[PDB]
Design brief:
56% of the residues lie in helices and 0% in strands. The PDB classes it as dna binding protein.
C-alpha cells in the first residue's frame, strides 16, 4: 500500500503525518528498496516540525548503505538544513565528511554544497556563542580543502574554486596574497601548487586578466603575445611537478611593492605571522614531506627574518632529501651579524644536516669543534683523535672521565659543556666504538634511563625529545649477543612491543628492516624474512633520490645496501630448495658456493663490509645444525682465515 502511497507523492498533496507511523515501521521491514521510496516521499511532506524519531534512525542507516541508489538520501537532508540546531548539527555533520570515498559522486555534489550553505550561513562576526558549534566551522573547511582537487569532474574544482573567490578571497591582490597562505597550511595533501597558480594568474591584479612569414608577429611583438604565454603556463603545470619557479618569482613581486609604499611596521608584523604559518607547515604535514617541492620552495624565501629553529627540516627534512644551507645563511649575516646572542641552537642543526649522510663528518668535524664549544681540553683530546683515526683508543680514555670524575677540576668550562658537551659527548658516546659491538656499547646507550635495566624508558624514549636518535645503536649491539647463546635480550622485549606497537609504533619504525630479516634466522621461518627484506630493497630504492654531490651520498647509500641485501637474498634463495638439495646429495655443490664468496671484494670503507662478515658466519652455523665435516671445517678454517688477515 505504501509503494502506491508514493505515486500520489509524485504530484504533491500528501500528509507526511497521516502516514508517519507508516514512514517509520516500513524502514525496518528486499529491505532497503521499500524504504528509499518513503524517503523521497518524506521530502515533500517535509519542512515540518520535530526530528526526535527521524534523527535516531537516520545517521544509523546513512553509513550502513554502501548502496548508492539508497544514497540519494544525502541530497534529501538538504531540506533538513534550515530547521537547524547547533549541537544537533555536530552529530549529523559526521556522515557528510565521510562521503568522499564512495563511487557514485552523485551525493558529493550535495556532500559539499550543504557544507557550502552551512559555511556561508554560519559566517558570524565570531560571536563565539558555542565552543562546540565553533568546532563545526573548522571541521567544515577541512572538507572544503580535502575536496578542492582529485575528482574526475573538473567542475567540482571550478565551482569550489570560484567559491574560494566570490566573497571569500578578497578582490584585492596583496590581500588575496595574505589570505591564500592561511588556506595552504591546513592542507595535509600534495598539490595545491596548481591552486596557487590558477588563483593568482587568472586574477592578474585587476578585475580582468589582461588590459591590453613576415606579416603577423612583426607589427605587434608586444601586446598580443603576453595574454597567451600567460595561460599556457599554469596548464602545463598541474600535469607534472616542477612549477616551483613561479613562487619565489612571486615572493619578490610580493616583497617589492611592500617596500616603496606601505609602512615598515605593519609589513614586519605581517611577515612575522608568515613564520607562524610556516611553523604550521612543520606540524600538519610534519613528516608528510615526500614531494620535497613543498619543502625547498618555502625555505627558499631569502628574506631577512626567515630563521626558524627548523627542527622539522631536521627530521622531516630527512624525508625531504635536501641539504639545506638555509639555517646557516642567516646566522652568517642577516640574523645576528651585530656567546649569548650567538644562536642558542641554530648552530647545531648544521651538525645534524652534515650528520644525516655520514664525508660530511669531516666537514662536520672541523666545524664541530674549535668552532663553537670552548672546552679546550675536551676539544684537543677529541679533535686530536679524529686525526689519529685511532679514536677507539685515544678519545675514549680522553672522554669518559669528564662524566665519571664529576668535574674534579675547576671545570669552569665543564659548566658550559653541560648544556653542550652533554650532547657532543652523546655524539661521542656511540662514536667511540665505530664498531666492535661489545656489551660495553649496549650498556653505553641504555645507561640514559634508570640505573637498573629499564625497558619502559626504552620504548618510551621513542616518544619524547631526543633519545630516539640512538635507537638503532642499541640494536647493532644485538650482533655481539647474537654471537652468544642466550637469545633472551632484545627479542623478548622487542618482538612483543612490535605486536602491541604494530598499529602505530612498530610499522612506523619498521623502516629499518635489515635487522628484522636477521632475527628470523633464530626461529626457522623464512617467509616474513623475505617479505620485510623485499620492502627493504624497494625503500633504499627511494633513498636513491640524490645525484648532486652524489659520491658521498651514494657511496654510503649504495656500497652497503646492495651488498648486504644480496648476501642475504643469495643466502635465502640458496638455502631452501638449493640448500635442501645440496645438503642431501652433493657436498661439492656446497663448495661451489664458497668460490663465489671468496672473490667478493671490499670497498676501502670498513663497517658493513666488516658487518656482513657476521652474516656469512650465521649462514654457516644455521646450516651446520640443519645438516663432509672436515670439508666444512676446512671452509671454516678458510673463510675464517680470510676475514681475519
Amino acid at each position: 500500500f505504501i509503494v502506491c502511497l508514493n505515486k500520489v507523492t509524485k504530484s504533491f498533496p500528501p500528509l507526511a503525518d497521516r502516514f508517519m507511523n507508516a514512514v517509520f515501521f516500513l524502514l525496518p521491514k528486499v529491505l532497503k528498496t521499500l524504504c528509499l521510496e518513503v524517503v523521497l516521499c518524506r521530502v515533500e511532506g517535509m519542512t515540518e516540525l520535530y526530528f526526535q524519531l527521524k534523527s535516531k534512525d537516520f545517521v544509523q542507516v546513512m553509513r550502513h548503505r554502501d548502496d548508492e541508489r539508497q544514497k540519494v538520501c544525502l541530497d534529501i537532508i538538504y531540506k533538513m538544513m534550515p530547521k537547524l540546531k547547533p549541537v544537533e548539527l555536530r552529530e549529523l555533520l559526521n556522515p557528510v565528511v565521510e562521503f568522499v570515498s564512495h563511487p557514485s559522486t552523485t551525493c558529493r555534489e550535495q556532500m559539499y554544497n550543504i557544507l557550502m550553505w552551512i559555511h556561508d550561513n554560519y559566517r558570524d562576526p565570531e560571536s563565539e556563542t558555542d565552543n562546540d558549534s565553533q568546532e563545526i566551522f573548522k571541521l567544515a573547511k577541512d572538507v572544503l580543502i580535502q575536496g578542492l582537487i582529485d575528482e574526475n569532474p573538473g567542475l567540482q574544482l571550478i565551482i569550489r574554486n570560484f567559491w574560494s573567490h566570490e566573497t571569500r578571497l578578497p578582490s584585492n591582490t596583496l590581500d588575496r596574497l595574505l589570505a591564500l597562505n592561511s588556506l595552504y597550511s591546513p592542507k595535509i595533501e600534495v598539490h595545491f601548487l596548481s591552486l596557487a597558480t590558477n588563483f593568482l594568474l587568472e586574477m592578474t591584479s585587476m578585475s580582468p586578466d589582461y588590459p591590453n612569414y613576415r606579416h603577423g608577429d612583426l607589427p605587434d611583438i608586444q601586446i598580443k603575445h603576453s595574454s597567451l604565454i600567460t595561460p599556457l603556463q599554469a596548464v602545463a603545470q598541474r600535469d607534472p611537478i616542477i612549477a616551483k619557479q613561479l613562487f619565489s618569482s612571486l615572493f619578490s613581486g610580493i616583497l617589492k611593492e611592500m617596500d616603496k609604499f606601505k609602512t615598515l611596521s605593519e609589513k614586519n608584523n605581517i611577515t612575522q605571522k608568515l613564520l607562524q604559518d610556516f611553523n604550521r607547515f612543520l606540524n600538519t604535514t610534519f613528516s608528510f614531506f615526500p614531494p620535497f617541492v613543498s619543502c625547498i620552495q618555502d625555505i627558499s624565501c631569502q628574506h631577512a627574518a626567515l630563521l626558524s629553529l627548523d627542527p622539522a627540516a631536521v627530521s622531516a627534512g630527512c624525508l625531504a632529501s635536501l641539504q639545506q644551507p638555509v639555517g646557516i645563511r642567516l646566522l652568517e649575516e642577516a640574523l645576528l651579524r651585530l656567546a649569548k646572542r650567538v644562536r642558542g641552537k641554530a648552530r647545531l642543526p648544521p651538525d645534524v644536516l652534515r650528520w644525516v649522510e655520514l664525508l660530511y663528518r669531516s666537514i662536520g668535524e672541523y666545524d664541530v669543534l674549535r668552532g663553537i664549544f670552548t672546552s679546550e681540553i675536551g676539544t684537543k683530546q677529541i679533535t686530536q683523535s679524529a686525526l689519529l683515526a685511532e679514536a677507539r683508543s685515544d678519545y675514549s680514555e680522553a672522554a669518559k672521565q669528564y662524566d665519571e670524575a664529576l668535574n674534579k677540576q675547576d671545570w669552569v668550562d665543564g659548566e658550559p659543556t653541560e648544556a653542550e658537551k652533554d650532547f657532543w659527548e652523546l655524539a661521542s658516546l656511540d662514536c667511540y666504538n665505530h664498531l666492535a659491538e661489545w656489551k660495553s656499547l649496549e650498556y653505553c646507550s641504555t645507561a640514559s634511563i634508570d640505573s637498573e635495566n629499564p625497558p619502559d624508558l626504552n620504548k618510551i624514549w621513542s616518544e619524547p625529545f631526543y633519545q630516539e636518535t640512538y635507537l638503532p645503536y642499541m640494536i647493532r649491539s644485538k650482533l655481539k649477543l647474537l654471537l652468544q647463546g642466550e637469545a633472551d635480550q632484545s627479542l623478548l622485549t622487542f618482538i612483543d612491543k612490535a605486536m602491541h606497537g604494530e598499529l602505530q609504533k612498530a610499522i612506523l619504525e619498521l623502516h629499518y628492516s635489515q635487522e628484522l630479516s636477521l632475527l628470523y634466522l633464530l626461529q626457522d621461518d623464512v617467509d616474513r624474512a623475505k617479505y620485510y627484506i623485499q620492502n627493504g630493497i624497494q625503500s633504499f630504492m627511494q633513498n636513491y633520490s640524490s645525484i648532486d654531490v652524489l659520491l658521498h651520498q651514494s657511496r654510503l647509500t649504495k656500497l652497503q645496501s646492495v651488498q648486504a641485501l644480496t648476501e642475504i637474498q643469495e643466502f635465502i634463495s640458496f638455502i631452501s630448495k638449493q640448500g635442501n638439495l645440496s645438503s642431501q646429495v652433493p657436498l661439492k655443490r656446497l663448495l661451489n658456493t664458497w668460490t663465489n664468496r671468496y672473490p667478493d671484494a671490499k670497498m676501502d670503507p670498513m663497517n658493513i663490509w666488516d658487518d656482513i662478515i657476521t652474516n656469512r658466519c650465521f649462514f654457516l652455523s644455521k646450516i651446520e645444525e640443519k645438516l663432509i665435516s672436515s670439508l666444512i671445517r676446512s671452509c671454516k678454517f678458510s673463510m675464517k682465515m680470510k676475514m681475519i688477515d
